[PDB]
Amino acid sequence: KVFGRCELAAAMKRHGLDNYRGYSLGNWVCAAKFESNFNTQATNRNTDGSTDYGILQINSRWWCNDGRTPGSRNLCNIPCSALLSSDITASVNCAKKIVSDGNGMNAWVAWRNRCKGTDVQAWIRGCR
Ligand SMILES: [Cl-]
Ligand SMILES: [Cl-]
Ligand SMILES: [Cl-]
Ligand SMILES: [Cl-]
Ligand SMILES: [Cl-]
Ligand SMILES: [Cl-]
Ligand SMILES: [Cl-]
Ligand SMILES: [Cl-]
């Protein structure tokens, strides 16, 4: 599923992600835009052989199991395919774990490089 901007803001809020760990909703929408272009089915292989899955590009090196990332953990206790569903619940639950891990949203290097410090409220501007 490819979400629209306000549609994804509303789904993130309904799953408790707004102001989670202090990160306003615009930060989470901005991160999703640049990680996946709002596409739940996005996947991207990393040079190390892990893969990033779903609308927040959760990495199989730590967070989910895809059966092909040797030496990697599954700290969200979830198959990485669960992170590609139209329903964003599994991605949001796993994002809550990640953002609690010590470095906040810096875990998402697109957030750090493209969202951090910017006017992230523009991402929710106009949304009901
Ligand atoms: Cl957009
Ligand atoms: Cl915001
Ligand atoms: Cl992989
Ligand atoms: Cl997803
Ligand atoms: Cl694996
Ligand atoms: Cl392994
Ligand atoms: Cl959803
Ligand atoms: Cl980047």
Side-chain angles (χ1 to χ4, degrees):
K1 173 165 167 176
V2 182
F3 276 82
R5 174 146 103 30
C6 299
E7 186 190 12
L8 182 60
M12 286 175 156
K13 180 171 184 180
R14 181 80 230 123
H15 289 91
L17 195 67
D18 53 319
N19 257 302
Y20 190 88
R21 271 275 46 89
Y23 286 96
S24 66
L25 191 58
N27 280 284
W28 296 101
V29 175
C30 184
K33 172 66 178 183
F34 298 124
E35 287 297 350
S36 63
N37 206 21
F38 303 149
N39 186 351
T40 66
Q41 298 192 82
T43 60
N44 290 296
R45 187 80 110 122
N46 307 126
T47 60
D48 77 354
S50 61
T51 300
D52 288 351
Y53 293 89
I55 209 164
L56 286 167
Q57 290 293 278
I58 306 300
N59 189 345
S60 66
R61 174 55 188 91
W62 292 109
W63 302 109
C64 62
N65 178 50
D66 68 3
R68 62 166 204 202
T69 310
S72 76
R73 307 277 289 285
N74 178 18
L75 290 168
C76 291
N77 296 296
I78 194 86
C80 299
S81 66
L83 286 168
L84 296 181
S85 169
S86 293
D87 185 302
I88 66 166
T89 306
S91 286
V92 172
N93 291 344
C94 187
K96 286 176 176 173
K97 301 143 192 164
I98 296 166
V99 77
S100 301
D101 192 65
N103 300 315
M105 284 192 75
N106 301 285
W108 287 275
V109 297
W111 176 89
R112 179 168 59 75
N113 287 331
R114 306 182 70 175
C115 299
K116 181 177 188 182
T118 75
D119 176 24
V120 299
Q121 193 278 158
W123 290 100
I124 58 168
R125 192 160 305 147
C127 307
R128 176 178 200 86

mmCIF file of all heavy atoms in Angstrom, residues 4-5 33 37-38 123, ligand 1:
data_model
loop_
_atom_site.group_PDB
_atom_site.id
_atom_site.type_symbol
_atom_site.label_atom_id
_atom_site.label_comp_id
_atom_site.label_asym_id
_atom_site.label_seq_id
_atom_site.Cartn_x
_atom_site.Cartn_y
_atom_site.Cartn_z
ATOM 1 N N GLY A 4 -1.046 8.039 1.405
ATOM 2 C CA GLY A 4 -0.891 9.488 1.340
ATOM 3 C C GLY A 4 -0.384 10.056 2.677
ATOM 4 O O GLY A 4 -0.440 9.390 3.740
ATOM 5 N N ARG A 5 0.204 11.233 2.623
ATOM 6 C CA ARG A 5 0.797 11.962 3.717
ATOM 7 C C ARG A 5 -0.117 12.000 4.950
ATOM 8 O O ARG A 5 0.205 11.550 6.074
ATOM 9 C CB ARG A 5 0.980 13.346 3.106
ATOM 10 C CG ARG A 5 1.443 14.365 4.007
ATOM 11 C CD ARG A 5 2.337 15.368 3.304
ATOM 12 N NE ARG A 5 1.652 16.624 3.007
ATOM 13 C CZ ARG A 5 0.649 17.175 3.700
ATOM 14 N NH1 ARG A 5 0.153 16.597 4.775
ATOM 15 N NH2 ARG A 5 0.127 18.330 3.311
ATOM 16 N N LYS A 33 8.590 9.204 4.680
ATOM 17 C CA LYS A 33 8.730 9.736 3.300
ATOM 18 C C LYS A 33 10.035 9.382 2.684
ATOM 19 O O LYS A 33 10.165 8.890 1.544
ATOM 20 C CB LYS A 33 8.538 11.265 3.340
ATOM 21 C CG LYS A 33 8.842 11.952 2.007
ATOM 22 C CD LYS A 33 7.859 11.553 0.970
ATOM 23 C CE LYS A 33 8.201 12.296 -0.284
ATOM 24 N NZ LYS A 33 7.196 12.000 -1.394
ATOM 25 N N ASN A 37 9.147 6.338 0.760
ATOM 26 C CA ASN A 37 8.159 7.100 -0.076
ATOM 27 C C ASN A 37 6.749 6.648 0.263
ATOM 28 O O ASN A 37 5.880 6.625 -0.601
ATOM 29 C CB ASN A 37 8.470 7.007 -1.553
ATOM 30 C CG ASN A 37 7.910 8.221 -2.307
ATOM 31 O OD1 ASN A 37 7.660 9.224 -1.718
ATOM 32 N ND2 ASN A 37 7.717 8.081 -3.583
ATOM 33 N N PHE A 38 6.516 6.284 1.519
ATOM 34 C CA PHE A 38 5.185 5.948 2.037
ATOM 35 C C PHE A 38 4.683 4.589 1.495
ATOM 36 O O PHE A 38 3.482 4.279 1.634
ATOM 37 C CB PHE A 38 4.129 7.033 1.789
ATOM 38 C CG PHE A 38 4.436 8.381 2.329
ATOM 39 C CD1 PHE A 38 3.957 9.529 1.660
ATOM 40 C CD2 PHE A 38 5.043 8.575 3.569
ATOM 41 C CE1 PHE A 38 4.145 10.780 2.205
ATOM 42 C CE2 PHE A 38 5.254 9.778 4.058
ATOM 43 C CZ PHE A 38 4.792 10.936 3.446
ATOM 44 N N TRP A 123 5.048 18.369 7.483
ATOM 45 C CA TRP A 123 4.583 17.071 7.036
ATOM 46 C C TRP A 123 3.189 16.757 7.493
ATOM 47 O O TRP A 123 2.555 15.896 6.899
ATOM 48 C CB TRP A 123 5.579 15.937 7.450
ATOM 49 C CG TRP A 123 6.823 16.103 6.625
ATOM 50 C CD1 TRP A 123 7.997 16.685 7.020
ATOM 51 C CD2 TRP A 123 7.024 15.639 5.296
ATOM 52 N NE1 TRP A 123 8.926 16.685 5.994
ATOM 53 C CE2 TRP A 123 8.334 16.096 4.890
ATOM 54 C CE3 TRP A 123 6.184 15.034 4.332
ATOM 55 C CZ2 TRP A 123 8.838 15.851 3.637
ATOM 56 C CZ3 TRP A 123 6.697 14.826 3.046
ATOM 57 C CH2 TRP A 123 8.009 15.231 2.717
HETATM 58 CL CL CL B 1 4.185 13.854 0.235
#
